[model samples]
Target: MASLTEIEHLVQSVCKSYRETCQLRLEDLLRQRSNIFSREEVTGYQRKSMWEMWERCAHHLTEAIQYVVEFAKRLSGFMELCQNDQIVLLKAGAMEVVLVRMCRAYNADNRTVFFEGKYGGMELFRALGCSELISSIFDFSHSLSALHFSEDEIALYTALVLINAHRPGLQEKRKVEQLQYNLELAFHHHLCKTHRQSILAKLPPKGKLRSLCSQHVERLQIFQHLHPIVVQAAFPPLYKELFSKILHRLLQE
Candidate 1:
C-alpha cells in the first residue's frame, strides 16, 4: 500500500518523540540518584532491623514512584484524558512501571538493588520478610538487565504499562487503546532497526507482570495484617493512594 511511507514517517517521529520526552527524564533521575547515593554509602551497610530497612527503602522507592508521574505526564495525550480514568490507570500500573524501572539501578552482577543510598543485596533484605516477592523482584531485575534495554525502549515500556486500555474501570477505553497502538507501532519499528525483535515477543509472557503484580498485592494484603496498626502511618501517602481502594477510588460509585 501507499501507506508504507506514511507509516514509516509516523514510526520514526514517534520514536523521536518517545526518546526525547521519556528517555531524558529517566536519565535525570538516574543522575540524581547517583549524586545522592554515591556519598551516602560512607555510612556503610549496617545490619538494619526489618522495619527499619523497609522504612529506609520505602522512603526512597516512594520517590521512585513519583518519577513515574513525570514520565507519564510527558507522554503526549496522557494529561488530556479524564482525571478519573487517569487515577484508575495510575492505580493499577504505577507499581508495575516502578518495578520494571528499578532495573536501571539494579546491579545484576552483585544481585543488589540500589535503594535508599545503598546497594541492597538479598541478605540486607533477609529480615525484611516477604522473601518470595523480594526474590521475584531480584529475579525480574536480573533477567531484564541481562537483556540490556536501551533507555528509549525502557521508556516505551513505561508508556505501555501506563497507557494500557485493558486496565479495569477505564472510562475512555477507545482513546487509551489508540495511544497504546501508536506505542506498539513505534516499538515494532524500533525493534526491527535495533535487532531486539525477540524481546518484543518474549517480554510479555502474557502474565509475567500480572503474576508479579498479583504477588505484590498479596504481600500488601499480608502486610496489613502483620503490621495492622502501623500500616496506616508507615506507608507513603501516594503509595497508599495507589494500592488501597479506600485511598484511590473516591470517584467510583
Candidate 2:
C-alpha cells in the first residue's frame, strides 16, 4: 500500500497523462502503455498544505514519478475492464445515466430524446425501453412482445403522454381498450372466481363518495388535453355516444 504522499504524487502524474491521452480518444494507450508516464518527478508535497493527491504530486518536478506511473497503470487496467466485460444491465443502466448527463451537458436542458427511433411503436412505449433493452440483451432468442405494459402501466403511461402533449398514436387506442378489458376481467375474476367481498362492499356515504369523486374530477380536469369527444371517436359508434354521455356527467363542473 502506497502512503498518502506517494499516492498523491502518483495520482497527479496519472491526471496529466490522462489529459493528453483523452484528447485524441486514445484511451487504449493509457490502458496498455506505461511509457506515456514520466519516470523522474520532484517532491513538492510542501508546496500546498492541501491534501489533494493530484495537486501535491504535480506540485514539483523531482519528487516521485514512479508513484504516478504505478497509479496510472492500475487505473487504466481497471477502466479497461470496466469498459469491456464488467458491464451488465446495472452497469448499462449507469451508462444510460451518464449518457443522459452528457446530453444535458451538451444541450443545457435535462430533457429526454424522444422521436429518435424510427419505429412509432417503439416510441409508444419509450418508458419501457430500458426494461426491454435489459431483457433483450440477455435473451436475443426471445421474440419481442407487442407491448410490455400492464393495464395500470398503460393508464399511467397514457397519462404521462397526455401531460407531455404527445398525440396519442393509433396503438394507444388499442392500449386503452386492452386496459379496459383487463379491468373488466379483473372485476369478474374477483366477483365470480374468487367470490370475495368485504372492503367497500357497502357503498360509502354520498358525502364521502363526493369527496373522493371530487379529487378524481380535479385530476381529470387538469388533464384537459384529453377531449372526451376525440377519445370517444376512437371507439365504436355505439359505445362512443354512451362514452361521451358518461364522460360529460363525470366532468361537470
Candidate 3:
C-alpha cells in the first residue's frame, strides 16, 4: 500500500493531469457564456413552448454534465475500472461529482450558487420548477464549505467519490473495495497531518455521501421528466459515447 505522503503526491499529479486534460476550470465555464441565458431570457423561455424552453435549458445542463464527465474520467483510480463498471460509477456518481465541482462557485454566506460564475438563484430554478433541487444543492454546498477543504483535499475526495465500491453493478467488487479503502485511509491521514485532528469525526461518513449522491440522482431523474425534450436535445449519441450512458440509465428508469 502506498504511504500517506505517496498518496498525497499521487492525488496532486492526478489533479494536475485531470485539470489539464479536462480543462474544467471555473473560468472555462464562465467563458462559455451561460449568462447568455439570463434570468429574463430563461423566464421568457419558460413562457414559450415547453419544447423550446427545455431545449435551451438542456443545452446548458448538458454542457455542465459534459464537463463533469470529462473531469471524472481523468481520475487515475476511476480509469482502472472495467468499461461496464466505469459506466456504473459515472451513472451513480455524476450528479455528486458535478455538485462538488460547483462548490467552487458557491458563496455560502449569501446562499448563492453560481454556474460558470453566473448567479443561479431561486427565481431561475423556480421558473424551471427545480427550486427544491437548488435548495438541496445549497444545503450540500453549505455543509461542504464548512469543512474548509484545501484544493488537493477536494481533489482526493472527488476521486474517492468516483471510486465508490458500494455503487451497484460492479464486476470487480473486491478490487473496487480495496481502492476505496486505500483512498479513505490516505484521506484520513492527510487530514490528520494537515489539521492535527486525527480522530476523523468531523468528516461526513460514507453513508452520508452515498445518500447525497442518491438524492442528486433522483433530482436528475425529476429534471429529465419535467423536460424530456430538453434532456433528449441536450444529449445526443455522441455524448452517449463520451458521457451520457449513466444519464440514459436514469432516464430509462
Candidate 4:
C-alpha cells in the first residue's frame, strides 16, 4: 500500500488535472461564446418584462442551489466512504449504508439550513458565478485523496480563473464543460469503490446522528461542489425546463 503522503501526492495530481480541465473549459466558453450563447433561447424566455427575466433567472439559480445541495449529499456520502479509507480503497457494500444516511441528512439540512441566514439567499446566483462555480466544482477533487497539503491546496488554484472570468462580461460554459469531463474522469479513475444506501447503514451513526448526516451533505455541497441532478429529477416540468442546464452545469461551472 502507498503511504498517506504518497497517496496525497497522487491525489493532488488528480486535483490539479481536474482544475486544469476546468480552466480549459472556461477558456472554451470564452472562445465559443457566440456559438454557445448566440441562441435566443439561451437568453430568451417567457417574461412579462425585465423583472420577469431576472426573476426567472434568479429562480433558476435557486433551483440550481437546491440541486447542488442534494448532489452534495449523495457525493458527500461517497466522499465519506472515500474519506474514511484514504490510505486504501472502499468496498461498495460499505458505501451503501453511508449513502442512505447521507441522503437523509441531505433532506434534513435543506429543510433546516440550506435556505436560511447569511449562509444562503436569493443571491446564490452571485456565488455561482463562473469562477466560483469552477473552483467549487474542481478544487476539491482530492480532498479525500493522498495528496500533500501544499500541492493539494494549489491543485485547484486554476479554478480561480472561473471567479475572475465572471468579473464583468464572461460566458464560458464550454470551457467549464471541457474541464468538467476531464476532472470527473480523473476522479472516477482513482475511485476504489462507490457508495449506495445499502452499504452505509452498517456503521452506526455518531455525534448528532441526524445533524451529522446533514452536515456531511452540506459539507459536500459547500466544499466538494456537487450539483443536484437527482433533486431536479424529482420535480416535474421544473425539472425538464431547467434540467438541461443547471443540473450538471453546477458541476461544470
Number of the predicted model whose lDDT against the real structure is largest: 1
Query: Which clashing pairs does model 3 show?
Result: none
Residue 149 of model 4, lDDT score: 21
> What is the Å distance of residue 6 in model 4 from its true position?
4.7
Give each prediction's root-mean-square deviation over alpha carbons. Answer: 4.8, 29.4, 5.4, 18.3
Enumerate residue pairs that collide in model 1.
Answer: none
- For 53-150, candidate 4 gives per-residue lDDT tens digits of 33344354344334333333233112232222211111111122222211211112221112211112222323333334323322222221222222
For residues 1-253, write the lDDT of model 3, one tens digit per residue.
7775777776566567446533355565445434444667547545766445444554555566666566656656766677778777777666566666666666565556554336555455554555565576677777777876666667667777777888888999988898888777766667677773533566566666566656545655676667666656554543334332444453223
Each prediction's total of clashing residue pairs, residues at least 3 apart in sequence or on different chains, is 0, 8, 0, 24
State each model's CA lDDT, in order.
0.68, 0.26, 0.62, 0.30
Model 3, TM vs. native: 0.73
Ranking by lDDT: 1, 3, 4, 2
Model 3 clash tally? 0
Off by over 4 Å in 4: 1-24, 34-50, 63-253
What TM-score fits each model?
0.79, 0.18, 0.73, 0.23
Off by over 4 Å in 1: 1-47, 245-253
Candidate 2 is scored at a TM of: 0.18
Q: Model 1, 1-253: lDDT tens per residue?
A: 2155654665555445445543224455455443333323423434555566656656666676665665565566677788777787777887788878778877766566665444556655665677898888888888888778887678667777888999889999998888788767766777788788988655756477878889877877776777766557887777666654432333232
lDDT of 2: 0.26
Could you give candidate 2's per-residue lDDT for residues 94-125 as a string of tens digits? 11212111211111121112111111121222
Q: In candidate 4, where is summed lDDT lowest over 10 consecutive residues?
A: 86-95
